Ligand binder design. Structure first.
Ligand SMILES: Cc1ncc(COP(=O)(O)O)c(C=O)c1O
Ligand SMILES: Cc1ncc(COP(=O)(O)O)c(C=O)c1O
Length: 226
């Protein structure tokens, strides 16, 4: 049951924030609906969920248009997959968030292709904090430069950071990797304006990411099936 799983996840988020002294309201739940059918999002929507994440551009845009045409308003769509330049326009025209900015060129394309009547596309810069097997995300030593360049793009808005740590089963390592991300997030927050989003944590490392200071968890399996 999707509705039951939504309520179960929100309780686990709420408990995890409370245990480490944070308000549950600090944590945004991003329902990762990738590869799930639109009918499943429809249940989530009917269960009160508004923020959905997609990894593939055309699947996402098709869903976005599906619910726009039903006249469902109030939804927030996050693109959280890797973004190739030949699909940037669909993202720039349809999505509300993009978590996967790791090169200045993809950000400038999104900026140029974003219609002016839309709000600025909220973007996060993706850090490869701990994955040698991923060709996605930058190193922390490159963050200040990319952030400063992306910060001037007027049709974008730099909101913070995202990372997908290498899979890790040890809670100790989960927390320490997430802390590195929280530390970098806090440093960015000092100088840049409106830095409020640390996209960090999935089903299995939710608690350490919340304890470390994530503001947004990306949950798929625990809501929709694997
Ligand atoms: C499940 C699914 N939906 C949609 C797409 C749409 O492809 P793209 O993201 O390259 O537009 C893909 C393939 O990449 C996919 O695997
Ligand atoms: C960026 C991102 N977040 C979250 C998930 C899925 O999260 P979960 O482990 O709960 O299925 C994936 C999808 O495979 C992902 O690529």
């Amino acid at each position: 049951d999707i509705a039951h799983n939504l309520a179960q996840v929100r309780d686990k988020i709420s408990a995890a924030a409370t245990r480490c002294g944070r308000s549950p309201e600090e944590i945004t739940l991003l329902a990762v609906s990738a590869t799930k059918p639109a009918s499943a999002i429809a249940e989530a929507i009917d269960a009160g969920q508004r923020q959905f994440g997609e990894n593939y551009v055309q699947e996402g845009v098709d869903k976005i248009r599906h619910f726009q045409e039903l006249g469902v308003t109030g939804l927030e769509w996050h693109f959280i997959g890797p973004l190739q330049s030949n699909k940037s326009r669909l993202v720039a025209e349809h999505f509300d968030w993009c978590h996967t900015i790791d090169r200045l060129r993809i950000a400038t394309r999104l900026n140029d292709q974003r219609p002016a009547e839309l709000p600025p596309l909220n973007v996060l810069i993706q850090i490869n904090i701990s994955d040698e097997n991923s060709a996605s995300g930058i190193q922390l030593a490159e963050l200040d430069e990319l952030a400063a360049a992306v910060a001037e793009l007027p049709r974008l808005r730099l909101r913070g950071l995202m990372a997908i740590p290498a899979p890790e089963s040890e809670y100790v390592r989960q927390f320490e990797v997430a802390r590195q991300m929280a530390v970098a997030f806090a440093g960015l927050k000092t100088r840049y304006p409106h830095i409020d989003t640390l996209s960090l944590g999935m089903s299995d490392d939710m608690e350490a990411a919340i304890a470390a200071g994530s503001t947004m968890v990306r949950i798929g399996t625990a809501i929709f099936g694997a």
